[PDB]
């Protein structure tokens, strides 16, 4: 649900697209996420390991 479950009813949303919101709030356009979707997973998976 991203973060909407904190503010009101929980609303489902795909996780592969939720990062577009988080990246948008940082100050980076959404186009960097999908075009680096495969790569950004590897950095996250390695970091969490």
């Amino acid at each position: 649900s991203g973060w909407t479950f904190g503010a009101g009813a929980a609303l489902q949303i795909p996780f592969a697209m939720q990062m577009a919101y988080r990246f948008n709030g940082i100050g980076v356009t959404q186009n960097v996420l999908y075009e680096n979707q495969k790569l950004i997973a590897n950095q996250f998976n390695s970091a969490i390991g």
Binding site: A16, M17, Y34, E35, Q37
Partner: protein, 35 residues
């Protein structure tokens, strides 16, 4: 490269600019070329 993309069409605001004028000009062209 983008995953999950889907096909669709996007309506440009310039599309009516050419739909309502160029054909009208073409109508004027036919009003001008035919005689």
């Amino acid at each position: 490269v983008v995953i999950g993309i889907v096909n669709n069409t996007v309506y440009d605001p310039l599309q009516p600019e050419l739909d309502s004028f160029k054909e009208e000009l073409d109508k004027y062209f036919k009003n001008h070329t035919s005689p």
